[PDB]
Ligand binder design. Sequence first.
Ligand SMILES: Nc1ncnc2c1ncn2[C@@H]1O[C@H](CSCC[C@H](N)C(=O)O)[C@@H](O)[C@H]1O
Lengths: 478, 19
Amino acid sequence: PKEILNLTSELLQKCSSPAPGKEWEEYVQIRTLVEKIRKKQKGLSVTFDGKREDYFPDLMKWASENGASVEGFEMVNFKEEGFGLRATRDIKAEELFLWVPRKLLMTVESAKNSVLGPLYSQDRILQAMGNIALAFHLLCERASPNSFWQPYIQTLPSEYDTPLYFEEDEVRYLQSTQAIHDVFSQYKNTARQYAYFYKVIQTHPHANKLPLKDSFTYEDYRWAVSSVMTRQNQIPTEDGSRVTLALIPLWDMCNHTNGLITTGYNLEDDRCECVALQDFRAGEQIYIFYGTRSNAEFVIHSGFFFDNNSHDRVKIKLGVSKSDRLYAMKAEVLARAGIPTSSVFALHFTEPPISAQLLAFLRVFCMTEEELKEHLLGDSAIDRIFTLGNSEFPVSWDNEVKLWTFLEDRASLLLKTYKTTIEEDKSVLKNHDLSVRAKMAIKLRLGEKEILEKAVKSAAVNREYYRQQMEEKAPLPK
Amino acid sequence: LKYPIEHGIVTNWDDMEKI
Ligand SMILES: Nc1ncnc2c1ncn2[C@@H]1O[C@H](CSCC[C@H](N)C(=O)O)[C@@H](O)[C@H]1O
């Protein structure tokens, strides 16, 4: 009791310590503390007597009573994705088959008007971060046995596959990747928030009535933030003025497949509406397309790795150096094109590996002084800036050879900073028997390297292609 | 499409970088 207080205070101090070479050691340090607290607590404060599926009939009845679609599908525990919706009749592509009225959602607005409302006005984090407001909304209603939203809360999972639930050795597979630093931040964010709100809830007057004051475990918080990150959605407010974050019951039981977004908010009728992404025959699982997220984002925020994610990408940080003889001119061209002199870009799995904005950056980054002047002076300078991201209008063959040479060298260098090779990773997946979470970790580190390798090959092809145009003295597109 | 909904949209959980 008083020992949990001292433990969380220690946790708050360490997790508020600034960024520290030593990121893995800090992660293991925080982990050791977190696990010490968790092992001294009783797991989830509120648990339900039934199995998860025993509550799906109540969800359907409650949703039906409040105007949601409840016919044409059923809940099924699928091995690959967990629970999901399965069609009980044939559903045709583009059919409006699912709808959920606003009254059923949990939103920041409904959090503010809940028992959490006093604390929400007083606390700066809750007012500034709707995702965290949503998480505590979820916890308070979970502990309120007569909550309007109990039918939804009693059908949520009780654990997730976000990295907050990984073993240390499962995270260890990600050492030397880009992704591990986002795993580190999420762990430290969540530990710091648990410690801070544990203190707040124990002492703040406006929290005295919260059921969390009786019991608020680390398990509770990890559960609530993972529920929110894997399921939250952005929707308009009632008046269409602003956006807010919302949990959307029933429809959020749909699992993910490749495609286009087919879910939208109907403001005139004040409900979420989902049309069929494809034909679903009776007996087929109903999927939606979650969004164009990277596999790092799917693993870290959504808790799964999606094979054949055509939107996969890795980050690359680039910038014009202040030590560049042409820094001022390059900075001005970038500013006129609306591009910063330094930021993080992406390398994409699909061809081409770079976006128009990264192509524009690389062209400027590789420009001679005469080329830069052509982008700053004269009536055509604005037109040149306009086409700076267009692969069909090169500044010059020479500029292209230089930028593609740079990208090939840089992607190759990045590949050399990984602890394992692509072939070693494929051998591990082939010959080791792994947990779901371990396989997520290894497929993520493999995919980072596969994206880089494709960028090396694409850049090599482009460099050679533009070398030939430069040798054949070919004319530039006008 | 009126107000497309990206399901599980990525949000910022870093209270220190945001406050
Ligand atoms: N294509 C996919 N492959 C594996 N898991 C998936 C998936 N699409 C969705 N999921 C899972 O579903 C979660 C989103 S909520 C969707 C319903 C969920 N399966 C449930 O049982 O409540 C994700 O965090 C992930 O666990």
